[PDB]
Amino acid sequence: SKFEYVRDFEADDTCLAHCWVVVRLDGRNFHRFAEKHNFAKPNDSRALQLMTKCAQTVMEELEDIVIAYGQSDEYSFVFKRKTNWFKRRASKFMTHVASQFASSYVFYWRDYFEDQPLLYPPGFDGRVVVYPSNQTLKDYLSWRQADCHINNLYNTVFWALIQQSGLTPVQAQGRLQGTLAADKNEILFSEFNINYNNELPMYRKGTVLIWQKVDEVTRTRTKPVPLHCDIIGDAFWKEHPEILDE
């Protein structure tokens, strides 16, 4: 050899054993991306479904992914805490997730965007977080869902004030400053006759991805099915105890 010594400079990044590993992907410069490709405001079904398809491909090509959660230009994957995949090297986790997701995006672009053409290949960033207890993982997922709900409740009335009322962005943002949750709900209900609760459950709750038994003559295989329910309340977790307790 006489050159292998450089490999000694590789630092270790093994994650603490018996701990949940979480990888969060976030699109890079996706505001400009949605701008160049005429994304629908405040929500675009094509983008959300394509993100879910990429997340399913990621869950299928890798292992030990027990749950995924997605929202506009973001996704999170939770690997099981007792995993031994890649000796718990966070670098492998995040690079595999990012590369697989980014390739699947360009691959399945056409399936969901029949009319729109992809102008350029997008970029993504990732990160790894280690959580020692089940409570902290539950709280992280609840944090993501609450962020989803708040952003959707703001953007719905913001684009209702820009599109159906003809206000510049500065005008709408000055109109919404200082409003509470029920305040925005009432602005919607009384100024546009739009009930926020009637909005699609995929816009105000995000997407969850869990293994379930499908059939397709007969194809009794497991696949990552999506859901659009609340993951902050104990009901979801008491209804699926095997995901956490294993």
Task: For residue 95, give Cα distances in angstroms to 5, 66, 102, 128, 137.
Answer: 24, 18, 10, 10, 21
* Closest to a second copy by CB, 14 or 168: 14
Distance separating alpha carbons of residues 73 and 33, to the nearest angstrom: 10
Phi then psi for residue 209, to 5 deg, are -130, 120
Stretch 70-99 residues interacting with a second copy (CB under 8 A): 91-92, 94-96, 98-99
Does 207 bind a second copy (CB under 8 A)? Our answer is no
Handedness of CA 202, 105, 69, 216 (dihedral sign): positive
Q: Is 130 in the site for a second copy (CB under 8 A)?
A: yes
Q: Identify the residue whose tokens are 């056409």.
A: 110
Task: Identify the CA nearest to 95 among candidates 134, 56, 126.
Answer: 126
For the purposes of burial, counting CB atoms within 10 Å of the CB of 148, is it exposed (0-12), middle (13-18) or buried (19 or more)? buried
Q: How many other CB atoms are found less than 10 A from the CB of residue 50? A: 19
CB of 132 or CB of 174, closer to a second copy: 132
244 binds a second copy (CB under 8 A): no
Q: Of 16-24, 39-47, 201-209, 210-218, which part binds a second copy (CB under 8 A)?
A: 16-24
Q: Say how many residues touch a second copy, by CB under 8 A.
A: 57
User: What distance in Å separates the CA atoms of residue 79 and residue 13, rounded to the nearest whole number?
Assistant: 16
Q: Which is nearer to a second copy, 15 or 48 (CB)?
A: 15
Per-residue mark of binding to a second copy, 27-56 (x: CB under 8 A) = -x----------------------------
* Among 68, 128, 160, 187, contact with a second copy (rule: CB under 8 A): 128
Does the annotation flag 104 for ligand binding? no
Structure tokens belonging to residue 214: 């499908």
> Which of 34, 118, 167, 244: binder of a second copy (CB under 8 A)?
118
Nearer to a second copy by C-beta: 68 or 161? 68
What is the contact surface with a second copy in residues (CB under 8 A)? 1, 3-6, 8-14, 16-19, 25, 28, 57, 61, 91-92, 94-96, 98-108, 118, 120-133, 136, 139-140, 142-143, 146
